[PDB]
């Protein structure tokens, strides 16, 4: 059975000093991850996934509709803990190599700062904001930002459940509406028939999620409050989170090719 594991740097007992109080982290991870895992266990209590890791379940249990509900819990548990394994008790100084490459893809550290934060509030829904490292056979390593609705896997092997666009407000009668509509059907028709829209390298190495940001309500609704009056709120939650990013660990997962 899947069981809850400790956090990175004893955040369960102490929590981040200036980002999330210990009580908030308790309700955000210990009292939520346990709930998700409890449900997940009951689902895979007697299937092949009884001993598979979360990621393996995510990728494996993606295309199949009959197991959609299993993907949610497995993916949510993964993304949730993926979001806590990138914070740090004290702010870390951005690495030089990483600092340079960021400016080459986003123009500045602040340009990307306001993009991820802006994307969060723009969504107006629970989701995860990622930082993905794109790479193609001949194209150099290029970074980009991705938004995943509810439980969305940023990996290319889980393209079926990427959930990058809310079909409610993104498909209308306007010129953009029709364009978004075609893509929506093009993906469904392709996936259903088994055709591949965008070629991906074997092993799912094209995209590597480096950093994540959990925008779900339970995470920030307690410490920062409803946000009425702009004091605190979801906006402040994203801002404060930007100060605890463990840029050192972020650089490691980036695995940028030496080009300096």
């Amino acid at each position: 059975q899947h069981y809850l594991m400790p956090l990175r740097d004893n955040f369960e007992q102490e929590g981040i000093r200036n980002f999330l109080s210990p009580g908030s982290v308790n309700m955000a991870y210990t009292e939520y991850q346990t709930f998700i895992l409890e449900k997940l266990n009951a689902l895979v209590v007697g299937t092949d996934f009884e001993q598979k890791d979360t990621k393996s379940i995510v990728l494996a249990t993606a295309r199949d509709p009959e197991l959609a509900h299993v993907f949610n819990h497995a993916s949510m548990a993964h993304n949730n803990h993926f979001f806590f394994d990138h914070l740090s008790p004290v702010p870390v100084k951005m690495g030089d190599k990483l600092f340079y490459h960021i400016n080459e893809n986003f123009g500045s550290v602040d340009t990307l700062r306001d993009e991820m934060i802006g994307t969060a509030v723009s969504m107006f829904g629970p989701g995860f904001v990622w930082l993905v490292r794109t790479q193609l056979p001949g194209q150099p390593v290029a970074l980009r930002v991705m938004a995943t609705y509810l439980a969305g896997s940023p990996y290319p092997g889980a393209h079926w459940r990427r959930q990058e666009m809310d079909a409610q407000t993104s498909i209308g009668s306007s010129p953009q509406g029709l364009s978004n509509g075609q893509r929506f059907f093009e993906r469904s028709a392709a996936g259903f028939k088994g055709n591949k829209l965008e070629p991906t390298a074997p092993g799912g190495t094209d995209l590597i999620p480096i950093l994540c940001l959990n925008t779900w309500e339970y995470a920030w609704l307690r410490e920062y409050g409803t946000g009425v009056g702009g004091m605190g709120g979801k906006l402040a939650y994203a801002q404060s989170w930007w100060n605890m990013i463990d840029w050192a660990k972020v650089e490691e997962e980036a695995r940028l090719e030496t080009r300096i």
Binding site: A77, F82, A201, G204, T205
Partner: protein
């Protein structure tokens, strides 16, 4: 043209992709939650257990006897009951006999005995070879050639031998003895399917050699010296039983070598090699006088 060139670029990109794919598999995997992996198919080979508990024996289907009709009333001493139309071998009866046999394998290996692990079935080759490595014994995963013990002079005529000592290292000076010496015979046979090969077990009893076998519900328990009532048709129980016996030999070999480093040999020269020493002194005596 372009179709063939594509294959080239791919074949030239596998090394780079493999390295990157391996690195990415490290950090990403294990992040979501701790899995409680409590069973792996190849766990009885990578790390077999020292002793097998009732749970291990029941989890490996070591109690599924054969159909009620195809039974041997002789071995009704181990049957527990009847369910699903088959005889259920008592779990405790298996564990008791298994621990006993494990003690036999250990002592025989502790006294410098030559053990032979015999499993002759489609998927028993890796199990027997692994057990032999641990116990430093001989393996056999094919049809036992009839007459390799009673007629060893012919069958095992050309196979080479060697002479070792306390610390299992060659002894130069026995060149003349390794040509008149007759082939060896196993000091202990550990069969994993006595029902199949009865010609081997008969030569053991005919040559006064102890044997260990996995007696099923339809196997005659009078063929082997030490019985291990269990399910022989299961590749998962056979790996467990063999693993336990392999660790026994390993533990036995360890004690022997530990006692040899202290100048305490736990075995005296065999009768065959003993005779050579007597002849050696006789030939040497002539040189002294002459």
């Amino acid at each position: 043209d372009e179709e063939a060139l594509k294959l080239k670029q791919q074949i030239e990109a596998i090394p780079g992709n493999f390295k990157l794919f391996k690195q990415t598999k490290a950090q990403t995997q294990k992040l979501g939650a701790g899995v409680e992996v409590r069973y792996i198919p190849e766990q009885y080979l990578r790390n077999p257990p020292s002793d097998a508990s009732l749970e291990d024996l029941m989890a490996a289907q070591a109690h599924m006897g054969h159909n009620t009709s195809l039974w041997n009333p002789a071995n009704a001493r181990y049957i527990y009951g009847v369910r699903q139309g088959i005889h259920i071998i008592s779990l405790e009866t298996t564990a008791t006999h298994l621990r006993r046999a494990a003690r036999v394998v250990e002592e025989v290996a502790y006294r410098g005995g030559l053990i032979l692990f015999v499993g002759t079935r489609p998927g028993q080759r890796p199990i027997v070879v692994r057990a032999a490595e641990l116990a430093k014994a001989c393996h056999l995963f094919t049809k036992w050639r009839p007459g390799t013990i009673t007629n060893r002079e012919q069958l095992l005529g050309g196979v080479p031998l060697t002479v070792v000592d306390e610390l299992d290292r060659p002894l130069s000076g026995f060149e003349d003895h390794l040509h008149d010496r007759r082939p060896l015979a196993p000091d202990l046979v550990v069969c994993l399917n006595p029902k199949e090969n009865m010609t081997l077990l008969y030569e053991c009893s005919l040559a006064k050699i102890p044997t260990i076998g996995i007696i099923d519900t339809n196997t005659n328990p009078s063929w082997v010296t030490y019985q291990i009532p269990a399910n022989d048709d299961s590749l998962r129980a056979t790996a467990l039983i063999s693993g336990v016996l392999g660790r026994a030999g390993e533990r036995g070999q360890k004690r022997r070598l530990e006692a040899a480093q202290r100048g305490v040999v736990t075995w005296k020269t065999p009768a065959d090699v003993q005779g050579y020493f007597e002849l050696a002194s006789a030939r040497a005596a002539d040189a002294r006088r002459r």
